[PDB]
Structure 1
Amino acid sequence: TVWETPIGVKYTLECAKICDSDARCNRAVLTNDLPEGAFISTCSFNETSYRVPETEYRICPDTDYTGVNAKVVEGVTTIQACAELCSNTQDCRKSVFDHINNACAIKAAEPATSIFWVQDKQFSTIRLPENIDPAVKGKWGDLIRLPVIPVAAYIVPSYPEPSRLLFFSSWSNDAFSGASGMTQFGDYDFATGAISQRTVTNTHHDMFCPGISQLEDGRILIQGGSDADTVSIYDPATNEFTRGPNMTLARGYQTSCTLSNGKVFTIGGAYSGERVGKNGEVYDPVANAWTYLPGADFRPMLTNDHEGIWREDNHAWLFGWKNGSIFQAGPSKDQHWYGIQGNGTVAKAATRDDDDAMCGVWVMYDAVAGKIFSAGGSPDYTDSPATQRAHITTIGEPNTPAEVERVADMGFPRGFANAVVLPDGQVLVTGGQRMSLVFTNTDGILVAELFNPETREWKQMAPMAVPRNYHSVSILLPDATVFSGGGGMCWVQNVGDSTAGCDKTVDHSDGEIFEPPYLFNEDGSRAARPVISISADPIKAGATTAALIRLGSVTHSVNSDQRRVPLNVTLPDDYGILLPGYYYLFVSTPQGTPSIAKTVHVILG
């Protein structure tokens, strides 16, 4: 028995309307689709327009705008009077009416401040609706609710294009501890909009805080984390998980990268296992064996962190390059080549910056010219003002110097931001916060920014709805849209222990999808997209505008699997440019408009 008020609110019919009249009433003697506190991208209820005496504003009932106020005024008794007050306040785009206390808040200016939109019966929100030109600024869809906070996500490789996204958290949907023989997992078909969860127990792996690398045959190698030694192998073709060999050394928060030769190198990972610097190691899918590399020395890639060595070897910016090489772009001030020959190899390649940029974003946007984009991050893991500084790092031959040029500063300092390269080799940076503060919404940037490497300039994109900071993700989707999601998670001392004491306002068990400008004509209508009608055949390197993009895996601001291979409309010879593994074929009109990718499985000589 569910009484649904006209405006759309819903109780679980005489005291009921008594309760709907008192903004302070949850119980009587309230059960909306979303819980109270939930963040929203769109009004969950029937809105109302409203015109001022001199001639407009949209009103969403039972909702709040959180963030700094320009003004709070105690006089006001009515939404209409709060609305009036906004019109008379210079630069007022958003205002809040507090039913309980007869108060009107004018929200401070976006994007200088960030403002969020929450379900809350105590309030009503008023807004001068932004006219957003999708041709200049793209468009965000509405929050997608998910069973599991997507702390880690990867595209499941399929034919003729992928349809699914796995994501995972820890032993719980919204909480982590230490080791626990289990991970909570979520499966989102973005063709059907279908969503399922599952507990993965068979690999005895809590995969929270892991390394992630897609192998040659498109299996995903999930390494360490809460079960610091345990390795899990995800088989797209059976959607089942297999136990890989224990790493030589227990790690968490380390990065891994697939190499030229379909081996996987990892270095660092002082978060879990022993709390000391971790030297390199390399997985051979063929031997099905890990090999400790004592000469792949952690010490040169250490950041200097206020929290010490726990953090310093974390989230290295690793790329497989030519002839089994590894480039380390950061986050440490200085960059380094690493090799797996003999027992190791490490050498300085360049100085990128005069400060470390922990969890800064990083992407190889042009493999064929070894161009790497980097921006944001913070000198320390947490309690650290993020940087606006960005760089193109140019890499020629493995183990010779590399070229770093400071390009223009981002519009916003970002810690814990996420990045994807797009078919045109533009980079989309989403989320992150002014000051790295683990488990916070604080000063989450909502405006996406698109860096043009051809121009070396930034454009501000339309704003998303939720802050995407610690434990968030971004990842390219086959239809050339960006998925942005997660945030939060709560530490509890033991597995099973109650989550009741956790602040869930920082938990964002959901995502949202960006349609970049390139999907829109000058009139805001969706551009006509090139279609493709390709052999589903393992093609090898060097065999015969367009671009390939390797399927992404992503956690903790680390996307080690994504790589843009620009083409001649004809694959390149070098596997250290064309890393083997599953890609996206993007054919795009010479105005800039791309296809729904066709999946292309590159294999080794």
Structure 2
Amino acid sequence: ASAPIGSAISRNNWAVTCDSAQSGNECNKAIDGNKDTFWHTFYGANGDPKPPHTYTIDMKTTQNVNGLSMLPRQDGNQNGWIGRHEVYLSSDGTNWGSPVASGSWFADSTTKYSNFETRPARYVRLVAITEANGQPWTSIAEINVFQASSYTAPQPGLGRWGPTIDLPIVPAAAAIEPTSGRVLMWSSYRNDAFGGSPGGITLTSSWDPSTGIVSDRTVTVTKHDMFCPGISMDGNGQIVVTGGNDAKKTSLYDSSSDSWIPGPDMQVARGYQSSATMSDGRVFTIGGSWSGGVFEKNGEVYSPSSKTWTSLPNAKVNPMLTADKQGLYRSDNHAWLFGWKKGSVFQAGPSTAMNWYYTSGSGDVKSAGKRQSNRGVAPDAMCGNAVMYDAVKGKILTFGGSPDYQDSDATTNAHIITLGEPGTSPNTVFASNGLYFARTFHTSVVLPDGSTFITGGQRRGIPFEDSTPVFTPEIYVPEQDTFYKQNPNSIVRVYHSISLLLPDGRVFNGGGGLCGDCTTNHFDAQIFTPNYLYNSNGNLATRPKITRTSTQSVKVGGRITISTDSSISKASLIRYGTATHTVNTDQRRIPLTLTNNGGNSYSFQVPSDSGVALPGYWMLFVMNSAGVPSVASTIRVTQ
């Protein structure tokens, strides 16, 4: 199931209008409180006018609206289930603006929701763009509109949440498809559940930022239910998805062909492992006792060139195990892995002990000391996040999490780890005064300006429960060693939530739940627009444009020349992200050293070390003197 975030508005004095309504299925049948009566558009005698079909509500007075629900006809007939849709709000009934929510609802008879940030409105409109099975009709048994108990205007300077993207699945895993710019998402064998899976199938969904279209695809070719997996983008531009509900399987997602390709089985069955792309484009993984068995699962390595997984049994998992009360089932999960110099992989946590992993021969592991500071030794931080915001300087920001996977209080702990050469123990210090809000199951992304956006989570880890939620995101600004609260959202994002950086410099945050008949499934995402995209006006800022790039593909150590429509102060490369269960081993940022050629022509060299400039797809962002970033130019980095 799911739930509204607000309280149902009394509909006593509502006036409603529909684009058309069959006699006996009048527009007002969707507001009579009777689940056995429904509105239905013209059919048979009246013709079958195709969608879009429209439901418009006049609530007579201004309400602090934060959602709607739509109950499909309950008579066992599928005709008129709403697929693609948009929700609009208005204070006048003529000027509707842009949708507050849009997307696609799953094809079934369950209550559907649009949950979105509070906005005072008197009128509400639901546009049914398509029928879920491609038929001409729209039907609705009951429509409700929900209110918050109050409204406060967002604070100037602190970003903005919205719109909502409605989805047919809970996006418990996600990736940017870098060649298309779309957001790829998946759940499990069902849109809302993983329990009871027979394996072999994954429901996926994509959202296209350019069109706003949400589509879906069932993936069976790879014989893989990809819930609870490792995820890495390899050097050959393929998303490598490992294990989970089918513990030994590898699925490959190829962005260029928009297709899934079977990969080699892993040597060890794994679930909840982290995998990390390496300096040579291969993918390393270790741990993962959620599935495939509970035992010591040492490293192994995937080669995109030979299409093999090779065991690295001497890359020992033991030194990175947390002291989780549930034991090995949890203690080898979600390692904070980062590909680094010369085929090495740094493991920054969640265990107190940090480690260097080595991929030559049959593998190795070397202690890198304890994550700590003058505040003391950092405790185990399961589902804490780790973000490499300056790969050139080896800088990793770590934060949050709890000593045990669940039933454990999260902390505000945050550290800066500074990587040097593999085999050396990195310096670690505390980050500012730590997080504003203790959280676990939170998610995070590095932004073009090197700040880290941190969102959602809860104070006490209770998977599938939306309790002790944190609604206020934070941004860490490294130059200031300071965290800043941002404007809060209204949708709980805890266990099974994701965040990814979008090519437009905004953040896509969604998911949470995946517990079947629970009411805590969130079939949606929201956009966060950082303050750097706004003028002091409160209007969206004018963005610099990248008018030319010398190339779209570059070797590490190589140069790129660009032209812009205005003078550029700073530039960065951000590697495209993948996300599930708090883990994102693909994102990282390289600040670029610009040569000014004059006439708004600029050059830069990609770092020569592929342990820094990890091969794969990257976003190029340029920022004007006002600190406003361009939209991303896509750059493939090769060896």
TM-score by length of 1: 0.80
- Alpha carbons of 1:126 and 1:220: their partners in 2 closer, same or farther (altered >3 Å)? closer
Give the alignment partner of residue 556 of structure 1, picking from 578, 581, 584: 581
Contact residue 236 and residue 304 of structure 2 kept, 8 A: no
Do structure 1's residue 155 and structure 2's residue 180 form an aligned pair? no
Do structure 1's residue 299 and structure 2's residue 318 form an aligned pair? yes
Contact residue 47 and residue 59 of structure 1 kept, 8 A: no
Offset of 1:272 from its aligned partner? 0.5
Alpha-carbon distance in 1 for matches of 2:39, 2:415? 49
Alpha-carbon distance in 1 for matches of 2:18, 2:492? 26
Aligned partner letter, 1:433: Q
Equivalent position of 1:340 in the other structure? 359
Equivalent position of 1:143 in the other structure? 164
Deviations 1:385-425 (A, max 9, x none): 11111111111111111111112221111110000000110
What SS is found at the alignment partner of 1:542?
Answer: coil
**Identity level (%):** 45
Equivalent position of 1:513 in the other structure? 527
Contact residue 27 and residue 39 of structure 2 kept, 8 A: no
Do structure 1's residue 571 and structure 2's residue 606 form an aligned pair? yes
1:127-142 matched pairs, under 5 angstroms: 127-134=149-156, 136-142=157-163
Equivalent position of 2:453 in the other structure? 428
Aligned partner letter, 2:555: K
Do structure 1's residue 362 and structure 2's residue 399 form an aligned pair? no
Alpha-carbon distance in 2 for matches of 1:397, 1:29? 69
Alpha-carbon distance in 1 for matches of 2:301, 2:24? 69
Offset of 1:142 from its aligned partner? 2.4
What SS is found at the alignment partner of 1:528?
Answer: coil
Give the alignment partner of residue 268 of structure 1, picking from 273, 277, 287: 287
Give the alignment partner of residue 237 of structure 1, picking from 241, 252, 256: 256
Give the alignment partner of residue 419 of structure 2, picking from 377, 395, 401: 395
Aligned partner letter, 1:418: T
Equivalent position of 1:26 in the other structure? 34
Offset of 1:350 from its aligned partner? 2.1
Equivalent position of 2:186 in the other structure? 168
Aligned partner letter, 2:621: F
Contact residue 396 and residue 417 of structure 2 kept, 8 A: yes
Contact residue 456 and residue 473 of structure 2 kept, 8 A: yes
What SS is found at the alignment partner of 2:445?
Answer: strand
Offset of 1:126 from its aligned partner? 5.9
- Alpha carbons of 1:577 and 1:62: their partners in 2 closer, same or farther (altered >3 Å)? closer
Offset of 1:46 from its aligned partner? 4.6
Contact residue 19 and residue 27 of structure 1 kept, 8 A: no
Do structure 1's residue 6 and structure 2's residue 30 form an aligned pair? no
- Alpha carbons of 1:512 and 1:430: their partners in 2 closer, same or farther (altered >3 Å)? same
- Alpha carbons of 1:62 and 1:150: their partners in 2 closer, same or farther (altered >3 Å)? closer
Aligned partner letter, 1:306: K
Equivalent position of 1:55 in the other structure? none
Alpha-carbon distance in 2 for matches of 1:130, 1:382? 34
Offset of 1:21 from its aligned partner? 8.4
TM-score by length of 2: 0.76
Do structure 1's residue 283 and structure 2's residue 318 form an aligned pair? no
Give the alignment partner of residue 540 of structure 1, picking from 530, 542, 555: 555
1:402-481 matched pairs, under 5 angstroms: 402-407=426-431, 408-481=433-506
Contact residue 48 and residue 60 of structure 1 kept, 8 A: no
Equivalent position of 2:47 in the other structure? none
1:184-199 matched pairs, under 5 angstroms: 184-199=203-218
What SS is found at the alignment partner of 2:342?
Answer: helix
Aligned residue pair count: 515
Structure 1 residues 529-538 or 547-556, which shifts more?
A: 529-538
Contact residue 17 and residue 27 of structure 2 kept, 8 A: no
Structure 1 residues 435-444 or 555-564, which shifts more?
A: 435-444
Deviations 1:312-341 (A, max 9, x none): 000000001111111000000111001012
Structure 1 residues 407-416 or 542-551, which shifts more?
A: 407-416
Aligned partner letter, 2:176: I
- Alpha carbons of 1:439 and 1:124: their partners in 2 closer, same or farther (altered >3 Å)? closer
Equivalent position of 2:407 in the other structure? 383
Alpha-carbon distance in 1 for matches of 2:165, 2:66? 21
What SS is found at the alignment partner of 2:456?
Answer: strand
Runs of 5+ consecutive residues of structure 1 not aligned to the other structure = 33-43, 51-57, 65-109, 111-119, 491-498
Aligned partner letter, 1:193: G
- Alpha carbons of 1:207 and 1:526: their partners in 2 closer, same or farther (altered >3 Å)? same
RMSD value over aligned CA atoms? Answer: 2.8
Contact residue 19 and residue 28 of structure 1 kept, 8 A: no
1:42-191 matched pairs, under 5 angstroms: 46=58, 58-60=63-65, 125=147, 127-134=149-156, 136-158=157-179, 162-177=180-195, 178-191=197-210
Contact residue 359 and residue 557 of structure 1 kept, 8 A: yes
- Alpha carbons of 1:520 and 1:340: their partners in 2 closer, same or farther (altered >3 Å)? same
- Alpha carbons of 1:329 and 1:18: their partners in 2 closer, same or farther (altered >3 Å)? closer
Alpha-carbon distance in 2 for matches of 1:273, 1:437? 24
Do structure 1's residue 329 and structure 2's residue 348 form an aligned pair? yes
- Alpha carbons of 1:123 and 1:315: their partners in 2 closer, same or farther (altered >3 Å)? same
Contact residue 426 and residue 453 of structure 1 kept, 8 A: yes
Contact residue 350 and residue 403 of structure 1 kept, 8 A: no
Alpha-carbon distance in 2 for matches of 1:241, 1:185? 11
- Alpha carbons of 1:13 and 1:358: their partners in 2 closer, same or farther (altered >3 Å)? same
What SS is found at the alignment partner of 2:442?
Answer: strand
Alpha-carbon distance in 2 for matches of 1:245, 1:581? 20
Do structure 1's residue 221 and structure 2's residue 240 form an aligned pair? yes
Give the alignment partner of residue 523 of structure 1, picking from 537, 548, 564: 537
- Alpha carbons of 1:45 and 1:18: their partners in 2 closer, same or farther (altered >3 Å)? closer
Offset of 1:31 from its aligned partner? 7.3
- Alpha carbons of 1:355 and 1:46: their partners in 2 closer, same or farther (altered >3 Å)? farther
Contact residue 31 and residue 144 of structure 2 kept, 8 A: no
Deviations 1:67-104 (A, max 9, x none): xxxxxxxxxxxxxxxxxxxxxxxxxxxxxxxxxxxxxx
Alpha-carbon distance in 1 for matches of 2:168, 2:68? 23
Runs of 5+ consecutive residues of structure 2 not aligned to the other structure = 1-12, 41-55, 70-117, 119-141, 372-376, 560-569, 595-604
Alpha-carbon distance in 2 for matches of 1:157, 1:63? 33
Deviations 1:466-497 (A, max 9, x none): 1111111000000000000011112xxxxxxx
Deviations 1:271-317 (A, max 9, x none): 00011121011111112211111111111100111211100000000
Aligned partner letter, 1:597: A
Contact residue 412 and residue 445 of structure 1 kept, 8 A: yes
Alpha-carbon distance in 1 for matches of 2:427, 2:229? 30
Equivalent position of 2:110 in the other structure? none
- Alpha carbons of 1:128 and 1:439: their partners in 2 closer, same or farther (altered >3 Å)? closer
What SS is found at the alignment partner of 1:454?
Answer: helix
Contact residue 14 and residue 58 of structure 2 kept, 8 A: no
Offset of 1:455 from its aligned partner? 1.1
